[model samples]
Target: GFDSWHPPAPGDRRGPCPMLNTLANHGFLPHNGRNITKEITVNALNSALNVNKTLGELLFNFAVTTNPQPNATFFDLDHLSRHNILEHDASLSRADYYFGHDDHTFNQTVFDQTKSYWKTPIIDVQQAANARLARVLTSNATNPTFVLSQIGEAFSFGETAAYILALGDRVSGTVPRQWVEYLFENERLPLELGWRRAKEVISNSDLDQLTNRVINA
Candidate 1:
């Protein structure tokens, strides 16, 4: 059955290879863990990014058999899976915070807690960045440097939440409930800060210089 599934190669441009590779290289995914096989990794990546499936879909499709729970949506499944993988991989200690258990997992008694808090905010940021890119593409702006800066801003803006969440998760002694509350309440703050910071960084530096700064940082 596994052999019937034909996923794209690592270098394939048709899929979300760029984002997938970026996330992997930046220590966001469970690349070095023994619990996760290469097939599962590829299948998850293809399902999530290539097929535009939600995190819930990935968990339901790939991880449900391993960690089964009744009436568990994809978000709940993903939260558990992410936490489990983080526990297994020591090198991903820094990356754990950004991708942890969903808010509902901590306190099921809270009001308006049915929806996924982390997923929504992150998607909003990425969608906003994509809109910005579309505007740049449609406009007759001929400034190459400005366009490149916009590109960098889009990338940085989209990934800002993950970075902030990662940082917040690393805080010591903070219980899961408190961290989840902080995340939901102040989700927009990090997006705003990230956009402002990216603007400042791109405003002062050329494309090549900014590239060097990122690589060095």
Candidate 2:
């Protein structure tokens, strides 16, 4: 039942990915271990990279945050299923933000509230790096840009340990007991090991090569 794929319409400004749709609707910033607000989420995302790293590092940070709310206690599988669909929509939002296609669509109220926390030097650097990368990717080139692969590569984990750390922060205490134990026993360790494999692939990838695939695929 989950086998269909569709391309986004011209100038549609949204992705067709089901998971992203789930996120766009329910994704929120977590404060005091609870979902705060959309604005907070946006702030946290833009601010995540500046704390330390390259533009590539900055994008990877956002990708982790963009994941489905894993440890949700209030929302069940049905809710998660829907959230999974919407997360794809939210990824479109992120893409738009990076490409400067819908700058005016950003919620001003949310920006005002969360931008304060993002004023640190780290955030400034992050924003600057992101801006630079976006520009570079959008520039017309003689060769193809591997946008999709770049995005996918950026999404890859470094090891089971890294995935465990990232997933734990996003889900551990928040998800139900059964699921938590399942992830711990079966998923976490393998994913940590998997990250090691991912890191090797990422090292050989190029920004243009990855971005091209993202745009075409």
Candidate 3:
């Protein structure tokens, strides 16, 4: 029976329409299922594509103007419900609809945790580094020795220290040899060489530890 099935034409709204095919191709819909209605399919597709409006509205407009279908209205729920793209249960939530026969609670928890991690500050490394360096710069602007020492610590620990040193050199014409040697151990070589050496010696784990210390302080 599956081998007898063929693809619908570009204009076939009674079968899998072009919009639904596109969604399936792009992994917005499941490849196979029995309960998936047009409404659920469009809802999931719209969410995955991040469209401002629902896929039904998009397809409805397309069908009305660019590719008009006979007696088609945007409110054709009967026609819409018949065009199943994937299997989904009749439920309001994606988890309940898709995972009705599976562990929906666990799946929902995992989905929520994933969303929460992305929204949390724990993963924002750039923001943490910026705030840390701001405090370091602000607290040491008047004291060159302190500033240089802090800059050396930053370089030793390996977090945005190259850019900080570049900024210091840009402002002061040259960074002090002592401060450069404090992190790198070599004074005669070009400062870039010393910077490279410092980075090579410090592991990422060490830098992460130092970053946590800076964040806490």
Across residues 87-198, which tens digit of lDDT does each residue of candidate 2 receive? 2112211222233333223333322332333334222223323333343343323114223343333332121112222222222211122322223222221222221112
Using all chains and alpha carbons, the TM-scores for the candidates as numbered come to 0.19, 0.19, 0.19
Question: Which numbered prediction scores highest in lDDT against the true structure?
Answer: 3
* Alpha carbon deviation, residue 60, candidate 1 (Å): 17
Better of 1 and 3 by lDDT: 3
Off by over 4 Å in 2: 1-28, 31-33, 50-80, 87-211, 214-217
Q: Candidate 3 regions off by >4 Å?
A: 1-20, 26-42, 54-59, 66-68, 74-217
Tens-digit lDDT track of model 3 for 6-117: 3323433232132333333333443332234446545643453333234345444533332224554332211332211221122111122222333112233423322332
- Point out where model 1 deviates above 4 Å: 1-35, 51-217
Score residue 137 of candidate 3 by CA lDDT. 51
CA-lDDT, candidates in order: 0.29, 0.28, 0.32
Ranking by TM-score: 2, 3, 1
Ranking by lDDT: 3, 1, 2
Evaluated against the true structure, the overall lDDT of model 1 is 0.29
